[PDB]
């Protein structure tokens, strides 16, 4: 059972075309730089939208983690299979790319079946890795599940994210994985851990619970986070970001998410003749996760 630190990081890097000012390409410059980006095993990153800060990143990436997968979502190239409700039309990707220190044996990707609002018009899913590691494999689902969105109706949101853990769950049971390799699940889940749908998530997904998670009390933090205090000033504070080993298999003693609330020099952009600074990297803060 080889022990991995796992980082997972909502980047916000909104397509440019659609959205020109919103930092992306320095923000994305500055991500590959941040300390919680550094010395991970797995990084597994949500909202890699713009294709050119995206593959910047990823490249800017390459040497520290040198195994990589496509954003989810693009296109059929460049993964072993494609599952899922994948269209082919659909200009939105599903922002998820997961990039290793160690090599990968197999990548796929699977779009979800079940989605609402704005997700559903998108290629949302999830990545799939197996990873070579000290005589062994690992395997890592990489994902962003559904957002709590205007376009869903009261209470579609959570009823749709606990589909998508199952499709998850489902996936996982077809490849009959052995119980003694490790099956991390890594991702903007969308599911605050201060909620009782916390308790469905693992449920839904055959998660067990991290012995601890340590740091910050909020990953996705609307009152300290500077993105997130603009974006949603009056919502509260939740705790969305999780990397959760699979019920049944073997694990480190002692796991850990830790969220590290760490922010950035100011950069500052203008919208509608008004200047604005900001002094974090995205509207998330980091979660590193890894043996204590």
């Not at 397509?15 to 980006?37: D, K, V």
């Not at 499709?167 to 201060?194: C, R, T, W, Y």
Request: proline letters at 5%.
């Amino acid at each position: 059972t080889p022990s991995l630190k796992v980082l997972t990081y909502n980047t916000f890097l909104m397509s440019t075309g659609l959205y020109p000012n919103w930092g992306q390409e320095h923000r994305a410059r500055e991500i590959a730089a941040a300390g919680f980006f550094q010395g991970n095993d797995v990084v597994v990153l949500q909202e890699a939208f713009d294709n050119a800060a995206a593959d910047g990143l990823k490249a800017a990436a390459a040497d520290r983690y040198p195994y990589q997968t496509p954003v989810v979502g693009r296109s059929r190239d460049g993964w072993d299979a494609t599952g899922g409700k994948y269209s082919a039309t659909t200009p939105e990707d599903g922002g998820v790319t997961v990039l290793s220190k160690w090599p990968i044996v197999r990548k796929e990707q699977v779009i979800f079946n079940d989605a609402c609002g704005a997700d559903w018009w998108s290629n949302k899913g999830f990545a799939y890795v197996v990873l070579n590691v000290g005589g062994t494999r690992v395997h890592v689902v990489g994902t962003h599940a559904q957002s709590t969105d205007s376009g869903c109706a009261a209470g579609e949101a959570a009823a749709d994210r606990s589909r998508q853990f199952r499709q998850i769950d489902a996936f996982l049971d077809a490849k009959n994985i052995p119980a003694d390799e490790q099956v991390m699940l890594a991702g903007d889940l969308n599911v605050d851990s201060h909620s009782a749908e916390y308790a469905s998530m693992l449920a839904d997904g055959d998660l067990a619970p991290a012995d601890s998670r340590a740091g910050h009390p909020y990953s996705f933090d609307t009152k300290e986070n500077s993105i997130a205090a603009y974006r949603y000033p009056t919502d509260p504070r939740e705790d969305l970001d999780y990397v959760l080993h699979r019920n049944g298999h073997a694990r480190p003693a002692g796991w850990r998410n830790t969220v590290v609330q760490e922010t950035s020099a100011p950069w500052t952009v203008s919208s509608w003749g008004k200047r604005y600074t900001y002094t974090d990297l995205s509207g998330h803060y980091p979660v590193i996760a890894g043996a204590n």
